[PDB]
């Protein structure tokens, strides 16, 4: 579907803004997640606030087929195949006693099969407990304490949250006994020791070039039953910064990564990692043109409430990803591909091409 691609493209553009402001830090992010919550926010907005979101996303949620295709994607990710591997939640919270526009909720429910949550921000500590507990119980206990003390206050009226957890189960797990500490070369020219997994398998391993003619390699690691894949991406030369690859690695490119005509055996060496990133979406969204939604008087959320002024006080995504030997609680020469320098990873939903997760690993 067109909307799956547009939603991934938008989310990747957001990831790029986040990566740009990240320095030498690890980042994990969800392009799918931010697209989904911003698509829902479109319903709440009007005027230039709506226009800015629709222009940046490249579609209107109200258009024919747009909402059904997003619902379909959501349903799919909740299928029986997902062994508590992905736990996501999108929620919009508005001031509980704020009068909402007649018919807004059933209309929101028709399109998304959820509602806008209604929490009393004037009771500050309680609202923060509520939002936090909501997030925790809807990510199978994985994202707790999203909001620390003082994250919201008495004047907070509207808050967007997107929280995701991922730990995939490999189609072929890495044997535990093959795991040991190896040197990893950081982009600042320093070297650290990190646990790295290793397996011999037939993976897709393709070489491409950037416009500036830098070589990069894409390794595909399928999860069980081929529904999801992790892609690992890195410049071939150590001197080439990861950013030369991030700035060009679009939704279009990723969705086009495909099988090798003949897959070949190789020994793969990959660092284990466990990353947690909290992203404040404000600056990334403003850089993509969505400035009005944050501005106290300029913001137009008249489709949600035409009673009192509204604007987004906070827009958060928090992602936790786990990459290990099996993705379970269990306990387990050809060409060598060794990932011992910073890399990008992409988790792709294969039937749709949807970019679920995206990140840079600067130091495992």
């Amino acid at each position: 579907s067109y909307v799956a691609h547009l939603a991934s493209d938008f989310g990747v553009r957001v990831f790029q803004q986040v990566a740009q402001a990240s320095k030498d830090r690890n980042v994990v992010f969800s392009p799918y997640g931010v697209a989904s919550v911003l698509a829902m926010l479109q319903l709440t907005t009007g005027g230039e606030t709506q226009q800015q979101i629709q222009a940046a996303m490249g579609f209107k949620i109200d258009d024919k087929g747009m909402a059904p295709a997003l619902r379909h994607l959501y349903k799919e990710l909740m299928g029986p195949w997902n062994k508590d591997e992905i736990s996501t939640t999108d929620a919009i919270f508005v001031q509980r006693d704020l009068k909402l526009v007649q018919g807004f909720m059933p209309h929101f429910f028709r399109l998304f099969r959820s509602t806008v949550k209604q929490v009393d921000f004037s009771e500050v500590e309680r609202a923060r407990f509520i939002i936090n507990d909501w997030v925790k119980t809807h990510t199978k206990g994985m994202i707790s304490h999203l909001l620390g003390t003082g994250a919201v206050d008495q004047l907070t009226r509207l808050v967007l949250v997107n929280a995701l957890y991922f730990n995939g189960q490999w189609k072929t797990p890495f044997p535990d006994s093959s795991t040991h500490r190896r040197l990893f070369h950081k982009s600042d020219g320093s070297t650290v020791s990190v646990p790295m997994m290793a397996q011999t398998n037939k993976f897709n391993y393709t070489e491409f070039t950037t416009p500036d003619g830098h070589y990069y390699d894409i390794l595909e690691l399928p999860y069980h039953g081929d529904t999801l894949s992790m892609f690992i991406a890195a410049p071939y030369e150590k001197e080439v910064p990861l950013s030369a690859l991030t700035n060009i690695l679009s939704a279009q490119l990723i969705s086009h990564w495909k099988g090798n005509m003949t897959r070949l055996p190789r020994l793969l060496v990959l660092p284990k990692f466990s990353l947690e990133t909290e992203v404040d979406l404000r600056k990334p969204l403003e850089n993509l043109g969505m400035t009005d939604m944050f501005r106290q008087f300029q913001a137009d959320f008249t489709s949600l409430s035409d009673q009192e002024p509204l604007h987004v006080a906070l827009a958060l995504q928090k992602v936790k990803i786990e990459v290990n030997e099996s993705g379970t609680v269990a306990s387990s020469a050809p060409e060598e591909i060794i990932i011992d320098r910073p890399f990008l990873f992409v988790v792709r939903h294969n039937p749709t091409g949807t970019v679920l997760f995206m990140g840079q690993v600067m130091e495992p």
Binding site: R96, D97, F104, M105, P106, T115, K117, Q118, V119, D133
Partner: protein
């Protein structure tokens, strides 16, 4: 005092008990919230 066909309407200050997704946090759920919504 019932949630029948109300699970989708959000908070309603005029109604005697609520049916919104957070009503349990406000100890205000109609007794049939669970079975309806």
């Amino acid at each position: 005092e019932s949630c029948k066909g109300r699970c989708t309407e959000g908070f309603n200050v005029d109604k005697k008990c609520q049916c919104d997704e957070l009503c349990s946090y406000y100890q205000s759920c109609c007794t049939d919230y669970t079975a309806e919504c």
